[PDB]
Design an enzyme around this catalytic site. Structure first.
Site, PDB file in Angstrom:
ATOM      1  N   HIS A  68      -1.147 -14.415 -13.134  1.00  0.00           N
ATOM      2  CA  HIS A  68       0.139 -15.149 -13.307  1.00  0.00           C
ATOM      3  C   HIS A  68      -0.076 -16.430 -14.120  1.00  0.00           C
ATOM      4  O   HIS A  68       0.244 -17.507 -13.636  1.00  0.00           O
ATOM      5  CB  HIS A  68       0.814 -15.433 -11.964  1.00  0.00           C
ATOM      6  N   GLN A 269      -1.780   2.745  -7.044  1.00  0.00           N
ATOM      7  CA  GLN A 269      -1.153   2.698  -8.393  1.00  0.00           C
ATOM      8  C   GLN A 269      -0.150   3.854  -8.539  1.00  0.00           C
ATOM      9  O   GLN A 269       0.985   3.584  -8.988  1.00  0.00           O
ATOM     10  CB  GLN A 269      -2.229   2.661  -9.483  1.00  0.00           C
TER      11      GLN A 269
HETATM   12  C1  JME Z   1       0.805  -3.068 -11.938  1.00  0.00           C
HETATM   13  N1  JME Z   1       1.686  -4.076 -11.331  1.00  0.00           N
HETATM   14  N2  JME Z   1       2.416  -5.032 -12.034  1.00  0.00           N
HETATM   15  C2  JME Z   1       2.983  -5.862 -11.199  1.00  0.00           C
HETATM   16  C3  JME Z   1       2.644  -5.475  -9.882  1.00  0.00           C
HETATM   17  C4  JME Z   1       3.124  -6.198  -8.666  1.00  0.00           C
HETATM   18  O1  JME Z   1       3.358  -5.628  -7.610  1.00  0.00           O
HETATM   19  N3  JME Z   1       3.315  -7.536  -8.714  1.00  0.00           N
HETATM   20  C5  JME Z   1       3.127  -8.597  -9.728  1.00  0.00           C
HETATM   21  C6  JME Z   1       3.022  -9.627  -8.575  1.00  0.00           C
HETATM   22  C7  JME Z   1       3.750  -8.559  -7.740  1.00  0.00           C
HETATM   23  C8  JME Z   1       1.807  -4.334  -9.999  1.00  0.00           C
HETATM   24  C9  JME Z   1       1.158  -3.552  -8.918  1.00  0.00           C
HETATM   25  O2  JME Z   1       0.072  -3.029  -9.080  1.00  0.00           O
HETATM   26  N4  JME Z   1       1.800  -3.402  -7.751  1.00  0.00           N
HETATM   27  C10 JME Z   1       1.302  -2.734  -6.633  1.00  0.00           C
HETATM   28  C11 JME Z   1      -0.022  -2.388  -6.525  1.00  0.00           C
HETATM   29  C12 JME Z   1      -0.453  -1.748  -5.333  1.00  0.00           C
HETATM   30  N5  JME Z   1      -1.655  -1.289  -4.957  1.00  0.00           N
HETATM   31  C13 JME Z   1      -1.528  -0.764  -3.718  1.00  0.00           C
HETATM   32  C14 JME Z   1      -2.606  -0.215  -2.882  1.00  0.00           C
HETATM   33  C15 JME Z   1      -2.294   0.470  -1.694  1.00  0.00           C
HETATM   34  C16 JME Z   1      -3.341   0.928  -0.911  1.00  0.00           C
HETATM   35  C17 JME Z   1      -4.657   0.659  -1.278  1.00  0.00           C
HETATM   36  C18 JME Z   1      -4.956  -0.064  -2.427  1.00  0.00           C
HETATM   37  C19 JME Z   1      -3.925  -0.517  -3.227  1.00  0.00           C
HETATM   38  C20 JME Z   1      -0.249  -0.902  -3.273  1.00  0.00           C
HETATM   39  N6  JME Z   1       0.445  -1.498  -4.296  1.00  0.00           N
HETATM   40  C21 JME Z   1       1.752  -1.861  -4.367  1.00  0.00           C
HETATM   41  C22 JME Z   1       2.219  -2.476  -5.495  1.00  0.00           C
HETATM   42  C23 JME Z   1       3.607  -2.858  -5.552  1.00  0.00           C
HETATM   43  N7  JME Z   1       4.708  -3.148  -5.573  1.00  0.00           N
HETATM   44 MG    MG Z   2       7.013 -13.929 -10.670  1.00  0.00          MG
HETATM   45 ZN    ZN Z   3       5.793 -12.401 -13.846  1.00  0.00          ZN
END
Ligand code: JME
Ligand code: MG
Ligand code: ZN
EC number: 3.1.4.17
Length: 313
Positions: A68, A269
């Site tokens: 960020h 993902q």
């Molecule tokens: C690419 N991207 N760009 C923005 C975001 C984001 O959220 N942001 C930006 C600040 C907020 C993401 C993201 O990757 N998001 C998530 C990743 C994720 N990994 C696991 C996960 C479950 C189980 C084990 C390991 C990982 C669950 N997850 C939920 C997610 C959501 N929503």
């Molecule tokens: Mg934000």
């Molecule tokens: Zn942002």
């Protein structure tokens, strides 16, 4: 007035494409943003001296966090640039002005922690702003910088135009609270499918701009695979630091933020592409057909994460 910004040939061509990466040369990012304001808005939209002073004050108020940061700000602004440039006639003069600025400012003074962590920490910001905590802070930081001497890039606007553009920016920044995205997209889906979507309806325009803000904010998933993959490292670097801080408060973090569960990232993902990203770019493509390349790139990256799980990489 007769001073255009010009980029090298490869950047001049690739900056028009949705999947453009702004590169590792931090000193070129201000010039890339000005270039995009000039082509997207006009050379007359802003006094160059005021704009340059605004950009450098915004840069200073982004922190040295893995994800960020100032690079995220300019990246999110470029995706908005690509949407606006592929939808020439759909947006007002004030919208084109406000939306690139909204994107540059949308994570001002981010500490790398979610709204949830501020609330569990009992951070002062959580008492000042009960919902969309960081996003209300980001808008507050935007107004603070606009009010610095020589930083009012909107000084030529009438009092009512000024109020309208700051309202566009406020709504646009609040919309980057991903908690609000789910309901926003459901309403837009229903409106599109019952044919009741009306771009002359201000409440409808607000919803569409919200979805554009989500699309731009998540645009790491619309890049070429090596960009997507390496950006995901920066995202998880923040999530895992938040998880460590949750453990310091005596709270087991969600798996997404637990570095002990790195192994489950690929499956995490998939959930994210299927629950958030693909639905976002699908609805955006339905409302704004020329944004289809974002949906295509997103699907290509979903396929890459499926390959990671099959141990093909
Ligand atoms: C690419 N991207 N760009 C923005 C975001 C984001 O959220 N942001 C930006 C600040 C907020 C993401 C993201 O990757 N998001 C998530 C990743 C994720 N990994 C696991 C996960 C479950 C189980 C084990 C390991 C990982 C669950 N997850 C939920 C997610 C959501 N929503
Ligand atoms: Mg934000
Ligand atoms: Zn942002």
């Amino acid at each position: 007035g007769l001073m255009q910004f010009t980029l090298p040939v490869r950047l001049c061509k690739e900056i028009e494409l949705f999947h453009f990466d702004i590169g590792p040369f931090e000193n070129m990012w201000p010039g890339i943003f000005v270039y995009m304001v000039h082509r997207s808005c006009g050379t007359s939209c802003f006094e160059l001296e005021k704009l340059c002073r605004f950009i450098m004050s915004v840069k200073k108020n982004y922190r040295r966090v893995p994800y960020h940061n100032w690079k995220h700000a300019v990246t999110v602004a470029h995706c908005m640039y690509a949407i606006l440039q592929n939808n020439h006639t759909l947006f007002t003069d004030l919208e084109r002005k406000g939306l690139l600025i909204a994107c540059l400012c949308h994570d001002l003074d981010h500490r790398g922690f979610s709204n949830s962590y501020l609330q569990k920490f009992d951070h002062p910001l959580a008492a000042l702003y009960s919902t969309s905590t960081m996003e209300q802070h980001h808008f507050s930081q935007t107004v603070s910088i606009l009010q610095l001497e020589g930083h009012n890039i909107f000084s030529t606007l009438s009092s009512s135009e000024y109020e309208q553009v700051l309202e566009i920016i406020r709504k646009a920044i609040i919309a980057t609270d991903l908690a609000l995205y789910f309901g926003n997209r459901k309403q837009l889906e229903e409106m599109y499918q019952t044919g009741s979507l009306n771009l002359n309806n201000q409440s409808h325009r607000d919803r569409v701009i919200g979805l554009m803000m989500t699309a731009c904010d998540l645009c790491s998933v619309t890049k070429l695979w090596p960009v997507t993959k390496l950006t995901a490292n920066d995202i998880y670097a923040e999530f895992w630091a938040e998880g460590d801080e949750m453990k310091k408060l005596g709270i087991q973090p969600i798996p997404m933020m637990d570095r002990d569960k790195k192994d489950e990232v690929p499956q995490g993902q998939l959930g994210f592409y299927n629950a958030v990203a693909i639905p976002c770019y699908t609805t955006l493509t339905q409302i704004l057909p020329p944004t289809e390349p974002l949906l295509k790139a997103c699907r290509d990256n979903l396929s890459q994460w499926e390959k990671v799980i099959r141990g093909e990489e």
